[PDB]
């Protein structure tokens, strides 16, 4: 049987995308720029802060100095930090707390394999810390998803090989990161987005201990 589960955060445990989007929208409006709607935010999704700010600046062809750039970057981030202060256990996606309790009582290790620089904070805010055996620091990995590095660290941090582990993800690069780590991915989304060579559920309600055991058992 599998020994660990490795959790993505955004789109699996909860939604941070929403707050990033408002952060960026609130910034673009504040400095004159139109067109930073949810549609355009699909271009900012897994992208770096600097890379995102370029793309918002390219919309109006706005010129900025290097210090003006880094202050705009900071100002978005400050906003985002303010905005995730209202995160509560009310924001934990469906079926997820229950999956954690069951994994825990079955002595299955639990690890976070998230790109969020705010993982630990977010987990305390949702009252989930007590379930998690390790949090993989995204600052301590050489390269981000789709590289496997983070899933490797999450597994190792609870003392398993990723081959002993299931990864849960909502995005294409995450699936590929789980795949290249040696872990088994179970997706949440559409096969349109994630692939048809892997097991995907339509939402997080379907991620049960029994379903993960079913999938492992091949
Ligand atoms: Mg995600």
Find the CATH number of the domain harbouring 87: 1.10.150.240
Whether residue 137 sits in one domain with residue 117: yes
The closest of 28, 31, 60, 55 to 42, measured between CA atoms, is 55
Whole-number CA gyration radius for the chain: 18
Residue at token pair 């096969």: 191
Q: How many angstroms separate the most distant Cα atoms in the chain?
A: 57
Look at the block and give the residue holding tokens 């394999």. Answer: 113
Separation between Cα atoms, residue 116 and residue 209, nearest integer Å: 25
How far, in Å, CA of 151 to CA of 213, rounded?
A: 20
- The crossing angle, in degrees rounded to 10, of helices 49-60 and 66-83 is 110
41 is in an annotated binding site: no
The answer to whether 184 touches 216, Cβ cutoff 8 Å, is yes
- Expressed in angstroms and rounded, the spacing between residue 171 Cα and the centre of ligand 1 is 6
> Distance, CA 180 to ligand 1 centroid (Å)?
17
Q: Tell me if residue 39 falls in helix, strand or coil.
A: coil
Q: How many domains does the chain have?
A: 2
Final residue in a domain of this structure, among 34, 69, 92: 92
For residue 193, the CA-to-ligand 1 centroid distance in Å is 13
Separation between Cα atoms, residue 122 and residue 132, nearest integer Å: 12
Distance CA 178, CA 209 (A): 19
- Chain center to CA of 205: 18
Report the C-alpha gap between 2 and 16 in whole angstroms: 28
Examine the residue annotation and report whether 10 is marked as an active-site residue of this protein.
yes
Q: Are 188 and 161 in contact (CB under 8 A)?
A: no
Q: Does residue 8 have an active-site annotation?
A: yes
Confirm whether residue 117 is marked as ligand binding. Answer: yes
Residues 102 and 149 in one domain: yes
Method: X-ray
Rounded-to-integer distance, Cα 203 and Cα 189, Å: 7
DSSP state of 127: T
CA torsion through residues 163, 143, 170, 209, sign: positive
Which residue's structure tokens are 């079955």? 106
Looking at the structure, do residues 36 and 121 belong to the same domain, yes or no? no
Nearest to 167 by CA among 203, 129, 123, 200: 200
Cα(161)–Cα(31) distance, integer angstroms: 48
Place of tokens 């067109």: 35
Listed residues: CB within 5 A of ion ligand 1: 8, 10-11, 170
- Please state at what angle helix 66-83 crosses helix 17-30, rounded to 10 degrees: 130
Which range of residues forms the domain containing residue 145?
A: 1-14+93-218
Does residue 198 share a domain with residue 99?
yes
How many whole angstroms from 16 Cα to the centroid of ligand 1?
A: 9
SS3 of residue 8 by DSSP: coil
- Alpha helices of the chain — where are they, by DSSP H? 17-30, 49-60, 66-83, 96-105, 119-125, 149-157, 172-181, 191-194, 209-216
Query: Are 171 and 201 in a shared domain?
Result: yes
């Amino acid at each position: 049987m599998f020994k660990a589960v490795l959790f993505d955060l955004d789109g699996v445990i909860t939604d941070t995308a929403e707050y990033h989007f408002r952060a960026w929208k609130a910034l673009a409006e504040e400095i004159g720029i139109n067109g930073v709607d949810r549609q355009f935010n699909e271009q900012l999704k897994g992208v770096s802060r600097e890379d995102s700010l370029q793309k918002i600046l390219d919309l109006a062809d706005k010129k900025v100095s290097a210090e003006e750039f880094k202050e705009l970057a900071k100002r978005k981030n400050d906003n985002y930090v303010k905005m995730i202060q209202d995160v509560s256990p009310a924001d934990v996606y469906p079926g997820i707390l229950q999956l954690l309790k069951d994994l825990r009582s079955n002595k299955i290790k639990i690890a976070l394999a998230s790109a969020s620089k705010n993982g630990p904070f977010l987990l305390e805010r949702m009252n989930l810390t007590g379930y998690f055996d390790a949090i993989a620091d995204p600052a301590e990995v050489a390269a981000s998803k789709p590289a496997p590095d983070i899933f490797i660290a999450a597994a190792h941090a609870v003392g398993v090989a990723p081959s002993e582990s299931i990864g849960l993800e909502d995005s294409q690069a995450g699936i590929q990161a789980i795949k290249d780590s040696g872990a088994l991915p179970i997706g949440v989304g559409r096969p349109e987005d994630l692939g048809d060579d892997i097991v995907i559920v339509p939402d997080t309600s379907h991620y049960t201990l029994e379903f993960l055991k079913e999938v492992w058992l091949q």
